[PDB]
Scaffold this active site. Structure first.
Site, PDB file in Angstrom:
ATOM      1  N   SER A 179     -16.796 -12.011 -55.208  1.00  0.00           N
ATOM      2  CA  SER A 179     -17.018 -10.525 -55.048  1.00  0.00           C
ATOM      3  C   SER A 179     -17.753 -10.113 -53.814  1.00  0.00           C
ATOM      4  O   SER A 179     -17.694  -8.775 -53.584  1.00  0.00           O
ATOM      5  CB  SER A 179     -17.522  -9.879 -56.299  1.00  0.00           C
TER       6      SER A 179
ATOM      7  N   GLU B 215      -6.609 -13.787 -57.875  1.00  0.00           N
ATOM      8  CA  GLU B 215      -6.667 -15.024 -57.186  1.00  0.00           C
ATOM      9  C   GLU B 215      -7.385 -15.386 -55.944  1.00  0.00           C
ATOM     10  O   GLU B 215      -7.659 -16.664 -55.722  1.00  0.00           O
ATOM     11  CB  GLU B 215      -5.249 -15.703 -57.126  1.00  0.00           C
TER      12      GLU B 215
END
Length: 269
Positions: free
Chosen positions: A46, A144
């Site tokens: 992230s 993914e």
């Protein structure tokens, strides 16, 4: 030469963790650095979302209406870990609010909406190239992109390139001054990093950061700008990975590596 003037026990730390740790830290006053596995690739997870918000701010320099533009979205946009955007499904959010949520809560729906508006992974990669970062690559959309497969260069950067780009965006001239301060303010308001770099930084120093946690292969990270009082700011990145899919990440290992980096720069903390 000013790299690793003082050795620190990073190898013992990563051996106890059971994986690999990558660190690059820069004292912006003197130019001295701490560097350990700093040019190896690690998954972004992230942590790409901080650079995404910076790319939005760069676009806003040419589009004065961009940040206040309202964005509506359907329930199909709400993927797991969308803690802010799920509260505004029935109303919409502005581009600035989506950017803040992506940075400060790692909101996945918000990041996906912004990435689409930038032209996808290649559009974000192009922004990083435009500031001189030749290492960063985003290749996939979520989820993914967080697969963290050993040896896979997709969706990776290096600790060194992350730090160099963070410095350009928060302290250098890559963004105009109002946008630079907005990026800093979003990072300062992050809520997900209290057990990582921030845990190594005294409470009376200012700090902004963005975290990442892939959920597999012991892979997690944090990058930060830190303003110690009375001296120039420090920019640093700490990335981890491990060989087995079910190896667990460690927040404590990230905090400990940050402590070693500050000690290596001679920053009393």
């Amino acid at each position: 030469m000013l790299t690793n003037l003082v050795a620190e026990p990073f190898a013992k730390l990563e051996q106890d963790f059971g994986g690999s740790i990558g660190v690059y830290a820069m004292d912006t006053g003197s130019g001295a650095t701490v560097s350990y596995r700093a040019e190896e690739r690690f998954p972004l997870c992230s942590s790409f979302k901080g650079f995404l918000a910076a790319a939005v701010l760069a676009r806003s320099q040419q589009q004065a209406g961009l940040l206040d533009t309202p964005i509506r979205y359907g329930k199909n946009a709400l993927v797991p870990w969308s803690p802010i955007s799920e509260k505004y499904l029935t109303t919409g959010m502005t581009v600035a609010e989506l950017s803040a949520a992506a940075v400060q809560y790692s909101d996945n729906a918000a990041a996906n909406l912004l990435l689409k508006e930038l032209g996808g992974p290649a559009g974000l990669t192009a922004f990083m190239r435009s500031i001189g970062d030749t290492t960063f690559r985003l290749d996939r959309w979520q989820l993914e992109l967080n697969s963290a497969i050993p040896g896979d260069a997709r969706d990776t950067s290096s600790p060194r390139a992350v730090t160099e780009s963070l410095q350009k965006l928060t302290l250098g001239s890559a963004l105009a001054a109002p946008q630079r301060q907005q990026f800093v303010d979003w990072l300062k308001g992050n809520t997900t990093g209290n057990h990582r770099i921030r845990a190594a930084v005294p409470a009376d120093w200012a700090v902004g950061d963005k975290t990442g946690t892939c959920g597999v292969y012991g892979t997690a990270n944090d990058y930060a700008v830190v303003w110690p009082t009375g001296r120039a700011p420090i920019v640093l990145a700490v990335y981890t990975r491990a060989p087995n899919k079910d190896d667990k990440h460690s927040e404590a290992v990230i905090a400990a590596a940050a402590r070693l980096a500050l000690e290596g720069l001679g920053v009393n903390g």
